[PDB]
Amino acid sequence: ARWFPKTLPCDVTLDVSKNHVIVDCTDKHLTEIPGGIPTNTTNLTLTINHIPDISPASFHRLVHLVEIDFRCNCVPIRLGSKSNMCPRRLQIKPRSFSGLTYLKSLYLDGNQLLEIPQGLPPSLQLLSLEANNIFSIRKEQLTELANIEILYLGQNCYYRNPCYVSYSIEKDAFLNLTKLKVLSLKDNNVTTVPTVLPSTLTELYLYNNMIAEIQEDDFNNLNQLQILDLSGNCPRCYNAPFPCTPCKNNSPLQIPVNAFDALTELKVLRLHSNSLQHVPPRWFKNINNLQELDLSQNFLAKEIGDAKFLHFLPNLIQLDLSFNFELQVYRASMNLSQAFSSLKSLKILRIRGYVFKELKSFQLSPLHNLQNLEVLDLGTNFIKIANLSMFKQFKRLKVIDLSVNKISPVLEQLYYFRYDKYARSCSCYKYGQTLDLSKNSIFFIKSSDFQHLSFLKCLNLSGNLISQTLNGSEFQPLAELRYLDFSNNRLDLLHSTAFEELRKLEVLDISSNSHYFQSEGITHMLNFTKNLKVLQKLMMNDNDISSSTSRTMESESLRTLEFRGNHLDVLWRDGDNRYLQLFKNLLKLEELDISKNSLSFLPSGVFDGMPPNLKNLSLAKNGLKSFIWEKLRYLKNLETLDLSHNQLTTVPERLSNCSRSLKNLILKNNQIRSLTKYFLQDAFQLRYLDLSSNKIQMIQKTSFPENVLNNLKMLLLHHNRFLCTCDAVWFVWWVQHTEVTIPYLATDVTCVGPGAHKGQSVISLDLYTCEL
Amino acid sequence: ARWFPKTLPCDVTLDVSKNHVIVDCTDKHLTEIPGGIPTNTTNLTLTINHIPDISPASFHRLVHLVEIDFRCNCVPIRLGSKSNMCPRRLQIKPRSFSGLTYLKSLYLDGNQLLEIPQGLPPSLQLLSLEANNIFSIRKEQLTELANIEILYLGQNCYYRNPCYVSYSIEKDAFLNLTKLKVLSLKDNNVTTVPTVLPSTLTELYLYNNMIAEIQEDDFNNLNQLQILDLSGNCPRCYNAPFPCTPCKNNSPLQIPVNAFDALTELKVLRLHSNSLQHVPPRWFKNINNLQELDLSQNFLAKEIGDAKFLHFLPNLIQLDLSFNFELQVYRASMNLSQAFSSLKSLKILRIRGYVFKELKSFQLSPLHNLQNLEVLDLGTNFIKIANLSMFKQFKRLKVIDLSVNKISPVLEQLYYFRYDKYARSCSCYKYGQTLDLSKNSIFFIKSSDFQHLSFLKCLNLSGNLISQTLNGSEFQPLAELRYLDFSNNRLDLLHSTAFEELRKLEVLDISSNSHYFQSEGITHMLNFTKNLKVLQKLMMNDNDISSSTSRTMESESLRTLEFRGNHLDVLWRDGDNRYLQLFKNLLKLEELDISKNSLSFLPSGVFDGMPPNLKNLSLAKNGLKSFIWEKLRYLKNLETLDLSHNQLTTVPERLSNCSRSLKNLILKNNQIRSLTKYFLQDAFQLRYLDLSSNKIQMIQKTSFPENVLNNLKMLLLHHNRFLCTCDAVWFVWWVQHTEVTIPYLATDVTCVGPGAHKGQSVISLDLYTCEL
């Protein structure tokens, strides 16, 4: 097909519209810029390599470069690999960028640079220098950046990349950058707000620094500023998972009451972890367009009961007052000021970590007529008592979050306490109203616990203590529930009527409920599915199921069953036929996951026992040592077969004689050492074949006919044990000249022998001596 | 040293007493009996190989054979490997055994034999034929066995190995085996007790068969019988994990009241799973010596409340009445007959699976004066209520077992429900009185829950629901407790006074209490250890610990800390020094397990931070990609270093220059491709080195000086990538002639190249062409 095999170890994509030729060499274990990069290349990415310097030669020919991403070719010691440390900082010779007359974006993050690289072209709008060793900014070094719009200078002086002195910025260093819109000086040991900043700024990031005081003039001219982040100046250090130095005398970040008066466009104000004890209403007199306010991680517990400043925030969309609790206090209740009722535009209110024992209905009354409220987050509060019926007054809300409490009858999980949540490195809400009770202390449930909550569409009970023999009487109010997460409980399936009161239930997760499955002699009614007549998806992973009182599960609605992490191996013990139809009467089942079931073999009858419409079958992670491929004939709708991570040593003699429907065959991470002579012959339906991470030496055209190979959307071959003799001449020619997508040709499709060619990439192999 | 390298692929042992030459070829992937077996061999084991036949050649030279163990060279299809099925039943040619005049024991189990092998010598005392296909016993085929004493014939006809007919035994088949003491016909589809059996029998196993009736004379002459097992005839089939057919009308096994009259010597009577509804006192009128009685898995719930037969069993040591509940009855209480008080010698009483809601003190009153009672097993009863103080009247007991119940304020776990618990295939009790409350529904504890139980030495609270912030007030009565198992709960370490009331605690297990360690911002006091002044061993595995409020753990007593399965990688994030002395002040710590902590590297300061007497360090399973060996100099008492299952690529240049104390170095399952030139030079302390499962090609004599090798107790080298060229000539010679124990030379110390010698064992290698 192809006339010229691409030997460049980089992905090349054309977007003809934009006008972009994209060359991506991310993580290609390079020590030089590869030769032969297309001269029309507009976007060149060299992230995560070990290229020790940049020079005039680097980009000589590439004069139509609009973006260079050269990040993390020498990342700071404590941020980088300890097994492959960078020996010596990136070296940028004079001249390296001045020729790139069209250069618009330059990323040099994480290269241990000591200075702002000079000689940059006047086309540059974005320059990024995060995680280098530049901790003194001089106006003379910024004159080259006349037209710069976005300047990232952060993470150059902080605990994971220390500079051991205070950051230094010359007076007015940035003022003549008359188009600068975004300046980030985060994580830099900065001690004062630099002045004067250009009035064109829209985004200013000064968080995680050592700024002890804001001067009243600091933001005087910033009448276009939309985002201001001063978080982490005078941090609140309790249970911080990074080294944390508070301001002395337990001072807050000192902010004069008129400090924001010029910020008439401000939309985002972030004051997280500033040790604030009060927030004066005067701050917000001239900020009427403010939409997002973050006051988490201060000392504002008392202020929350007063909060006069809220009267000045009628357009506020999101408010975060999380983790303002007083150390060593376990409040009886939450005192919300009535001033909360002035937040008529509020959609998201987060008050994690206030820390109180009992939530009462009236305590939430200031929120009753907030008609746009979508999310109420009272997580991580150690609440012991809450009558869930109080949320009958919150039908309009999308999410009510009571997660991580101690009640008894999405944000990345390290969110409020990580150092820099925006650090750049080298779910059932969609069903409707959601009550999240996950990780609480609920040991017993009864119908009245859910009185007045029939509007609920998703209930999350994951990670509670529920241990009772559910009999269809526990969720009677929840007539609209579509999704129940019951994972990480101790479900006892004594009654096959469990969950039957949830007549609209579409998704049920009872994964990680193994407790009562682990003890012999206990009744388990796995046929409880029969009563749920709109159930689509059932998850019962990691339940350690090795016994069942019922011989069959039944449903006319289920399409998806996850049954991973169980013991079908003992249920299907050789010589016991009783459970071989366990899934047969799930008549509409399309996807079955029975990975991780210790199935070292499949007894005969397993495939005959599958329900008739099975599309997606996983048998991964089973230690399967053998597989009668012909039995796939029973699976007449089989489309995806996942046999990854097993011990298989052979493929079928003729795949077409095993399944006429099979489209996607995943055989990665097995022990296959050779293919059968006619393996893929006439398997015209095959579209995806993964044989990576096996031990294949040879592939001949008889096993891999071109009439089948050319229809494949993807063919995975990497990490095998290819022998590159003259017997491999067809295989080597084909991979070099095929348009079928094969990943990791640059990385991991290599000869292991013979001697000469060991370790060499198959794509670069010259086998001319075989035709001499 | 050795003049003749041992090439036989079998372990050879001398017992001089003796008179034994033991050759063990278990699981050596043999297809023939290997040549060169010592002529003096007395015990020859060939179990689990694929030797297709036996002939007079097999054992020709071996005329001092006292035992042949030839098990499982052709296991029945459903009991054996599906990846290596046996093609053809074992073939025993004539005369193969008649020559072995001293043969006393012959095991031919699991070979698919169709008939009892003939021509066996008259010395034979033990013949074992389990799991073959012999299901018709003819007196003519037994005449060869005149002197036989032990005869195993079971598992020849049952669901895992069917014969599709009833077992057949000719009348008097065994009568003339006048020295037969042990006859086993279990798992055989037998329909009647064979008669007449020889009066010399001491043990008769007829369990798991189809015997519906015992005739009153079936055991008439067995006046020497000591063990009788009739279990699994008319089985009780509820929740059976094997195919189970009951007797029709669910009759019990019918046993005449005088059936045991001749059995005056009976010590063990097993009547498990016989669907008994009554046990007539008249059964035991002439059985005065009975010590063990198993009546589990019958229908004796009512009988337990009456039980007149117990008055006839004053010497009974063990009684098992487990799993006698009435189906689908949930009794309020346990009705134990007063007759239990006559069991004057009883030490073990097991009544699992009676199934009742409430245990009260007076219900155990029939046991108050059983002065020899040592264990009371009331597990798996679904008990909801029990005042634990009632056990103040059972201080003499060694174990009180309430495991697997529903209380709220060792037997292999497939024990009562396994088909054949004695099937042959091819803990804190030692601390004193134990109350086992594991796997219950205890969500809250207070001191009064343990009133009057101060005698307890071990409490098992594993797998409950305990979620509270322990503060030293929960276990106050337990003044003698030496061992607390608190694993699989939800420990909340808000207070560092947790557990301090247990002043005699020597072992604390708080493993798998990860729940509150998985949510950010929560207080965790890992320094609670300071208060436990005799704590020796602390297990906190799998707690997912990634954050801690205390920077240091402290103890003057702790010897052993298990900290596996946590996140020291994030606690020790590079650039965060705060936790680098977390373990330093555990001043007597000798053993530290910090495997499975995702430590792909160790930040500097980890070794300096270890406590001074650390002897045994595990860093296994961490993904370690690098290791500064010199840092071991800080660990001046280090004796064992376990780095198994990591990604290490190098060993230190000179181990002795890194650690003068190190005795045991485990490096198995790494990526090591070569040893340093002088690796072991002068490591006079080294006694144990494991380099197995790496990628070593070559080992030169400089790396392995013989003054060091000769002190090694063991050196593990198997599963590497040895190159057997003339450069390997020293290593090959050394391996062949050394006395150092190296395991698996027969199995897995092999050449991977060059071509000629691929797959060949190094021990068998002739490299004479290298000296031509």
Ligand SMILES: CCCCOc1nc(N)c2c(n1)N(Cc1cccc(CN3CCCC3)c1)CC(=O)N2
């Ligand atoms: C030892 C095997 C006993 C039978 O199996 C079994 N399995 C379980 N999961 C459980 C269980 N019993 N029981 C005991 C039990 C036994 C029979 C009938 C009933 C229910 N009736 C209807 C109303 C009250 C009585 C409960 C309690 C439990 O929570 N769970």
Ligand SMILES: CCCCOc1nc(N)c2c(n1)N(Cc1cccc(CN3CCCC3)c1)CC(=O)N2
């Ligand atoms: C958001 C973090 C809150 C602080 O941390 C924290 N961690 C825990 N594990 C828990 C916890 N609080 N609390 C709240 C809390 C906080 C401070 C003091 C006290 C108890 N005092 C003793 C005498 C008067 C009150 C309780 C309850 C709990 O069970 N557990």
Ligand SMILES: *[C@@H]1O[C@H](CO)[C@@H](O[C@@H]2O[C@H](CO)[C@@H](O)[C@H](O)[C@H]2NC(C)=O)[C@H](O)[C@H]1NC(C)=O
């Ligand atoms: C931030 O700046 C401070 C100084 O303002 C740095 O602290 C100094 O560090 C050196 C050596 O570590 C000490 O000798 C000085 O006494 C320190 N001064 C103070 C005021 O502490 C600090 O290291 C800088 N932070 C980072 C991450 O580099």
Ligand SMILES: *[C@@H]1O[C@H](CO)[C@@H](O[C@@H]2O[C@H](CO)[C@@H](O)[C@H](O)[C@H]2NC(C)=O)[C@H](O)[C@H]1NC(C)=O
């Ligand atoms: C135990 O013996 C019974 C009969 O004594 C066997 O049952 C017969 O099995 C054959 C073949 O499956 C059937 O055609 C007969 O109808 C059965 N007879 C009766 C009376 O049921 C049984 O197969 C044997 N069990 C094993 C494990 O081999």
Ligand SMILES: *[C@@H]1O[C@H](CO)[C@@H](O)[C@H](O)[C@H]1NC(C)=O
């Ligand atoms: C190419 O560069 C331009 C300018 O920096 C950018 O807008 C575009 O997204 C880039 N395309 C990539 C990186 O694929």
Ligand SMILES: *[C@@H]1O[C@H](CO)[C@@H](O)[C@H](O)[C@H]1NC(C)=O
């Ligand atoms: C919870 O509140 C409802 C009112 O919505 C009330 O009817 C119910 O009794 C309350 N439950 C408890 C336990 O107080």
Ligand SMILES: *[C@@H]1O[C@H](CO)[C@@H](O)[C@H](O)[C@H]1NC(C)=O
């Ligand atoms: C329920 O909560 C758990 C625990 O916080 C979370 O991981 C899971 O995604 C939630 N389930 C759904 C369906 O949102």
Ligand SMILES: *[C@@H]1O[C@H](CO)[C@@H](O)[C@H](O)[C@H]1NC(C)=O
């Ligand atoms: C489920 O299990 C058995 C039949 O398999 C039966 O006793 C029980 O009534 C069944 N219940 C349902 C709802 O199918």
Ligand SMILES: *[C@@H]1O[C@H](CO)[C@@H](O)[C@H](O)[C@H]1NC(C)=O
């Ligand atoms: C050797 O055989 C005799 C007789 O069968 C037996 O008693 C002895 O235990 C055997 N020894 C070993 C080590 O197998």
Ligand SMILES: *[C@@H]1O[C@H](CO)[C@@H](O)[C@H](O)[C@H]1NC(C)=O
């Ligand atoms: C116990 O049961 C036996 C027989 O079922 C009966 O004789 C006796 O009265 C019962 N006692 C109690 C206390 O239930």
Ligand SMILES: *[C@@H]1O[C@H](CO)[C@@H](O)[C@H](O)[C@H]1NC(C)=O
């Ligand atoms: C438990 O029994 C003890 C007597 O041993 C008694 O003092 C105590 O009151 C009982 N506790 C309960 C909760 O009944």
Ligand SMILES: *[C@@H]1O[C@H](CO)[C@@H](O)[C@H](O)[C@H]1NC(C)=O
């Ligand atoms: C406690 O009981 C569990 C079973 O529930 C067992 O796994 C564990 O070993 C026991 N602990 C001790 C110390 O015996």
Ligand SMILES: *[C@@H]1O[C@H](CO)[C@@H](O)[C@H](O)[C@H]1NC(C)=O
């Ligand atoms: C420990 O907790 C109990 C109740 O949980 C409380 O009564 C007691 O005062 C606490 N102990 C101390 C020393 O505060």
Ligand SMILES: *[C@@H]1O[C@H](CO)[C@@H](O)[C@H](O)[C@H]1NC(C)=O
């Ligand atoms: C544990 O550490 C805390 C400080 O983090 C301290 O207040 C407490 O008293 C310490 N407890 C012990 C037993 O050392």
Ligand SMILES: *[C@@H]1O[C@H](CO)[C@@H](O)[C@H](O)[C@H]1NC(C)=O
């Ligand atoms: C070292 O501790 C491990 C537990 O990780 C133990 O299994 C091993 O036997 C110990 N080794 C020595 C030599 O004490």
Ligand SMILES: *[C@@H]1O[C@H](CO)[C@@H](O)[C@H](O)[C@H]1NC(C)=O
């Ligand atoms: C390591 O070897 C050098 C040179 O022989 C020696 O000076 C040094 O003291 C040694 N270190 C240790 C810890 O033995």
